[PDB]
Amino acid sequence: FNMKLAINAKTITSGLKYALATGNWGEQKKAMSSRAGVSQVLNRYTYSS
Amino acid sequence: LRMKHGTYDKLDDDGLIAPGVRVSGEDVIIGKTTPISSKRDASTPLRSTENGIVDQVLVTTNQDGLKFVKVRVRTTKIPQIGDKF
Amino acid sequence: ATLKYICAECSSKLSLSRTDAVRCKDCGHRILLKARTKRLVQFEAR
Amino acid sequence: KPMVNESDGVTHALYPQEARLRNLTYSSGLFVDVKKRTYEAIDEL
Amino acid sequence: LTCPECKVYPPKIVERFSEGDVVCALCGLVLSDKLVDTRSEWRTFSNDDHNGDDPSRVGEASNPLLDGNNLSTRIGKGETTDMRFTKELNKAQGKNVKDNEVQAAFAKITMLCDAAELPKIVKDCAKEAYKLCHDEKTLKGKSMESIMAASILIGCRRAEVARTFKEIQSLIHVKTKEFGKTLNIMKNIAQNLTYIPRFCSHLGLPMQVTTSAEYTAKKCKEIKEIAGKSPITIAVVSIYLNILLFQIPITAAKVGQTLQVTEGTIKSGYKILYEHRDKLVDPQLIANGVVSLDNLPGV
Amino acid sequence: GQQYSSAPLRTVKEVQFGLFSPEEVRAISVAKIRFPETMDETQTRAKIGGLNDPRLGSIDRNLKCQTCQEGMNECPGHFGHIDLAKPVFHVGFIAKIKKVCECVCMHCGK
Amino acid sequence: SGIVPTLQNIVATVTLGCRLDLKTVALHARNAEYNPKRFAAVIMRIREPKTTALIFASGKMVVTGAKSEDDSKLASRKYARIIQKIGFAAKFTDFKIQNIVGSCDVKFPIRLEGLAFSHGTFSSYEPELFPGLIYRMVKPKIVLLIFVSGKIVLTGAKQREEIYQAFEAIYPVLSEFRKM
Amino acid sequence: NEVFSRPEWMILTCLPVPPPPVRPSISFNESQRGEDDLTFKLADILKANISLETLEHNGAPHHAIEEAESLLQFHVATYMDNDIAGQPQALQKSGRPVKSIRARLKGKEGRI
Amino acid sequence: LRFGEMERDCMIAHGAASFLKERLMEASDAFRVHICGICGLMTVIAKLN
RNA sequence: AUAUCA
Ligand SMILES: [Mg+2]
Ligand SMILES: [Zn+2]
Ligand SMILES: [Zn+2]
Ligand SMILES: [Zn+2]
Ligand SMILES: [Zn+2]
Ligand SMILES: [Zn+2]
């Protein structure tokens, strides 16, 4: 029972990276209904913005 | 193949414009080719509706080590007619 | 003479070519800049 | 603390500015203690 | 295309994309009027639309190099769906389905690269090396978990991702002599500098030490001081020389442990290099603490 | 431009909607369509005598459009057929079919 | 030049023509080994010429260890006589040399990586796996193991001239890639 | 109507295959190529067809055939309309549902 | 730009029959096919040359 | 797909 073969790191790593990036808060590249726009690019027009 | 009508002269042999050169519409900021066979043109031209002077140009590799380059272009926008306030 | 690329932090000039290694000499940091054209730019003072 | 795994194996700290420029992710490592026990009985204990 | 009026051998023609025309640059004759945006047209195949609202999104991109041309959708749950018909139409796809299932050996390569911390360009070379050699009569009956373990070092040896064969022996599995013969029958169809970053990191040495070890090891080879010792040993030895020269030292036991070499062997290379320690170091190396060239162990 | 055809230019006066008789679908068709393969004559750069242009329409800035020639900016593109193993319902009628069965005898057709 | 390769080992096959009882053979021979569980042959040896024979129940025999073709045939006839003396209706037939190994020293170090790059289609060099370069010659079809030290191993020959031919052919190449 | 629309013509026996103009392809860079959702959906119809043809030809196991028929039924049906009430949608790898023909004509932003 | 549905309406209101035809044809889409006189289909193999 | 514009 080789440990490195057992636990797939990419599962949680890219699983969070997907949500945060795209914004479809759910698993994963097969998302719907998933809630899009949960994560979005921070407005940097003005400081108040 | 399929070159941009814009000019490529402002490119140094590394395929980038050196920072400081003034650019203009349709001009080629970044020269790129996608060899397939001799090779098609995959270059980046400045937006045709804009112009200015190149501010800074940086060369890097990413998480897996793909060479990629970022080019900053600076203009000064002086209040004109249809300008909102 | 000639400084192909500059360093982001330590600001030490680099002058490297294609497949030389995208890194700085002393500090690690793979950032690196480009250094202004020697083809002097002129602006209208308006 | 946040780190980065470069192409040439080496792992090192990663500051927010380097993340934004090299388009990386400002993430840190998650580590968990794992234990693997084994038990046996014959044909309850 | 070539202008019908002029005809000069290098046919100088421009693509005035903005006016949607293809012109002859010499006479000015328009050679074509229908002209399409390839960027936006490609946006219809590879988009950001995963929800399904985009009317522009109407196709999907495929990879003819890796999976040939296998167009195939998947029966899945939609908005108004009974969980019954999904099962039946999926249980009906089971009777229509061997080699169209050996593509799950790509899932073996993908799960091995991600367990070996390997880039996206390496997987796609390991998957192309495996697709073009898994049905070969030249490989015949080699250990099927050692021919995909050999096609990962084939994909790494082109993508410039330093991975020793003993690094892939740790992943799976590998039988050494078995995946060493298989790494040659496919090939018909590292260096000192490679390890230095990782070993040094585990060692916890500074950039200064790494650079010098890296310089020494290269010089050692250039000098040909170590006739045929394995590069891993050379590197571990060089790391020993440089580190001992600097303040933060590392012992043979500790270097060997990281390099996965034995102290005796590191000793072997080290003593061979030591005689030319002076030539080996970087010129602006600063020996510190109390370790100058004269003082280095010499062991 | 788009080249001259001796055909008389006329305007559309009536549009006669209907369903396709399988006899007609077969009759129009310029290709059989036998294989789920796009192009790639096994790792190649030409269309397969099977799906898109088995004898069919033309694309990729190349004339070859079965004698018709012309190419892209003239060719309307002509249809192929696919011979189905067993009859299937056209999803849109499924209900008109149902209603017709509901009206007629499921043995004598009266 | 001036160097001529030295023969180091000759492997040959001989058909005795009759079935053998291996326990009997092993029991009666003066210098025999036989453990059915490890290998299916009697491992017999003679002192002159110093060789080793692998004797099978089918009556086929492999003779190895000789340094000359003469010694190979000589030792083979001797093994056959032993089988006869033990009592079987053996015959010395089909003597054939299957492999000849040779070696020499060019007296200068070689740049294996340069050679491997230059003669890439015939070469195989993985110093971490095995320190020598494996060179697969087309004509004659001989395999050479080339080492940094300048020591050379030639094998796969059916005739002595092939060993000599290959070295003559490789020498200019080894010279081109010398270190001093 | 005896000329233009006999009821026998509602059940599909032969399938008109639309030409590339209706389902364009794009050849990017030799390892990237884009096919239209219809070309995908067609290939499934074909594959499902080729399968059921082999089943009838061979020893017809009755219930393994009608099982393969109602698969064909689905692919053909889902190709003209993917938004069917009660039925599962045909999906395209990325999780997005296949753009059926109906759906190209339908909405504002439709062909009409 | 889009000469959309609501714009079609204004043109229809104005009685600008030819201005509309132009917007929809000459100024955009316009194409030429060969049709059959028997079955009013785009079947015709026009080898116009 | 989010944000936004009258
Ligand atoms: Mg207003
Ligand atoms: Zn620096
Ligand atoms: Zn011209
Ligand atoms: Zn045509
Ligand atoms: Zn009746
Ligand atoms: Zn007609």
- The alpha carbon dihedral of G34, G36, G39, G42 has a sign of positive
| Structural domain for F20, as ranges | 4-87
B touches D, CB cut-off 8 Å, minimum 3 pairs:
yes
Rounded CA Rg of chain E: 29
Contact of E73 with chain F, judged by CB distance below 8 Å, is answered with no
| Cβ(E182)–Cβ(E139) below 8 Å | yes
- Tallying the residues shown for chain G, one arrives at 180
| Structural domain for E261, as ranges | 194-275
d(CA G154, CA G168): 12
CATH code: domain of residue F36: 4.10.860.120
Contact between chains at A31 and H96 (C-beta distance less than 8 A):
no
| Cβ(B12)–Cβ(B18) below 8 Å | yes
Return the HEC string of E110-172. HHHHCCCCCCHHHHHHHHHHHHCCCCCCCCCCCCCCCCCCCHHHHHHCCCCCCCCHHHHHHHC
**Ligand 1 centroid vs B81 CA: distance in angstroms?**
16
Looking at the complex, report in whole angstroms how far the Cα of residue E118 sits from the nearest Cα belonging to chain B. Answer: 8
d(CA B54, CA B17): 8
- The alpha carbon dihedral of E177, E182, E188, E190 has a sign of negative
- Which nucleotide is nearest, taking the CA of residue B84 and each C1'? J5
Q: Decide: helix, strand or coil at residue E292.
A: coil
Q: What angle do CA G7, G11, G16 make, to 5 degrees?
A: 145
Single-letter amino acid, residue E186: M
- E191: nearest CA in chain G? G128
Query: Which residue's entry shows tokens 């037939």?
Result: G93
Counting as contact any 3 or more CB pairs under 8 A, the partners of H are: A, B, E, F
Q: Decide: helix, strand or coil at residue G155.
A: strand
Choosing among 2.20.28.30, 1.25.10.10, 3.30.420.270, 3.50.50.60, the CATH entry for C4-46 is 2.20.28.30
Q: How far is CA E181 from CA E149, G130, I21, in A?
A: 12, 12, 74
Bridge partners for E23 per DSSP: E14, E30
Helix (H) or strand (E) holding E31: strand E30-32
Give me the phi and psi of E131, to 5 degrees please.
-75, -25
Which tokens belong to E135?
């049905």
d(CA H72, CA H80): 13
Looking at the complex, report in whole angstroms how far the Cα of residue D7 sits from the nearest Cα belonging to chain C. Answer: 12
| Cβ(G87)–Cβ(G21) below 8 Å | no
Which protein residue's Cα is closest to nucleotide J5 at C1'?
B84
Rounded CA Rg of chain I: 16
- A21: nearest CA in chain E? E48
**Ligand 3 centroid vs B1 CA: distance in angstroms?**
18
Residue among D6, D12, D21 minimizing CB distance to C31 = D21
Which tokens belong to B38?
């001799």
Give me the phi and psi of E194, to 5 degrees please.
-65, -45
Would you give the DSSP letter of residue G41? S
d(CA E138, CA E72): 32
Ligand index nearest the alpha carbon of residue I44? 6
Strand residues in chain F grouped as ranges (E): 80-88
Which tokens belong to E96?
């229509």
Give me the phi and psi of F25, to 5 degrees please.
-55, -45
Nearest partner of I47 among F80, H21, F70, judged by Cα: F70
Q: F80: left (phi > 0), else alpha (psi -120 to 50), else beta?
A: beta
Single-letter amino acid, residue E213: A
| Cβ(A12)–Cβ(A3) below 8 Å | no
For residue E127, how far is the Cα from the chain centroid?
Answer: 12
Contact between chains at B64 and E121 (C-beta distance less than 8 A):
yes
Interface of H with F in 6-35 (CB under 8 A): 6-7, 9-25, 27, 33, 35
Contact of H88 with chain A, judged by CB distance below 8 Å, is answered with no
Give me the phi and psi of D25, to 5 degrees please.
-110, 130
**Ligand 4 centroid vs F71 CA: distance in angstroms?**
7
Interatomic distance A36 CA / J2 C1' (Å)? 8
Single-letter amino acid, residue G101: V
- The alpha carbon dihedral of E243, E245, E248, E249 has a sign of positive
The DSSP annotation for E178-204 comes to HHHHHHHHTTT---HHHHHHHHHHHHT
d(CA E69, CA H79): 19
Would you give the DSSP letter of residue H7? G
Q: Decide: helix, strand or coil at residue E226.
A: coil
Contact of B36 with chain H, judged by CB distance below 8 Å, is answered with yes
Helix (H) or strand (E) holding E90: helix E83-91
Give me the phi and psi of D2, to 5 degrees please.
-55, 140
Burial class (CB in 10 A: 0-12, 13-18, 19+), E267: middle
Bridge partners for G45 per DSSP: G52
- Which nucleotide is nearest, taking the CA of residue E57 and each C1'? J1
**Ligand 4 centroid vs I49 CA: distance in angstroms?**
13
- The alpha carbon dihedral of E78, E80, E83, E89 has a sign of negative
Residue among G129, G149, G179 minimizing CB distance to E165 = G129
Nearest partner of H74 among H98, H94, H108, H109, judged by Cα: H98
Which tokens belong to D39?
């038990």
Contact between chains at D9 and E197 (C-beta distance less than 8 A):
yes
| Cβ(D28)–Cβ(D19) below 8 Å | no
Can you list the pairs that B62-65 forms with residues at least 24 positions away whose Cβ atoms lie under 8 Å?
B62/D22, B62/D23, B62/D24, B63/D4, B63/D5, B63/D7, B63/D22, B63/D23, B63/D24, B63/D25, B63/E119, B64/D7, B64/E119, B64/E120, B64/E121, B65/D6, B65/D7, B65/E119, B65/E160
Which tokens belong to I19?
């201005």
- Measured between its terminal Cα atoms, the distance across chain G in Å is 15
Chain F partners within 8 Å of H6 (Cβ): 19, 21
Q: How far is CA F55 from CA E215, H13, H86, in A?
A: 65, 21, 38
- Stated in angstroms to one decimal place, the resolution of this structure is 9.7
Residues flagged as binding site of I: 36, 39
Number of H helices, E strands in chain I: 2, 0
C-alpha count within 13 angstroms, C-beta hemisphere, residue E119 = 23
The DSSP annotation for B16-71 comes to BPPBTBB--TT-EEE--EEE---EEE--EEPPTT---EEEEEEEEE-TT--EEEEE
Chain E partners within 8 Å of H104 (Cβ): 55, 58
Q: How far is CA G81 from CA E233, E242, H57, in A?
A: 53, 67, 70
Number of C-beta neighbours around residue G18 at 10 A: 13
d(CA G13, CA G63): 6
Contact of E18 with chain B, judged by CB distance below 8 Å, is answered with yes
A touches D, CB cut-off 8 Å, minimum 3 pairs:
yes
Q: How far is CA D35 from CA A3, A5, E170, in A?
A: 11, 16, 21
| Cβ(E227)–Cβ(E188) below 8 Å | no
Helix (H) or strand (E) holding G153: strand G151-157
**H37-57 and H65-80 are packed helices; what angle lies between their axes, rounded to 10 degrees?**
160
| Cβ(G150)–Cβ(G108) below 8 Å | yes
Bridge partners for G133 per DSSP: G146
Which residues lie closer than 8 Å to E104 by C-beta, 6 or more apart?
Answer: none
Query: Which residue's entry shows tokens 């067993």?
Result: F86
d(CA E116, CA G21): 56
Q: B65: left (phi > 0), else alpha (psi -120 to 50), else beta?
A: left
d(CA E236, CA E225): 15
Residue spans per domain, chain C: 4-46
Contact of H29 with chain B, judged by CB distance below 8 Å, is answered with yes
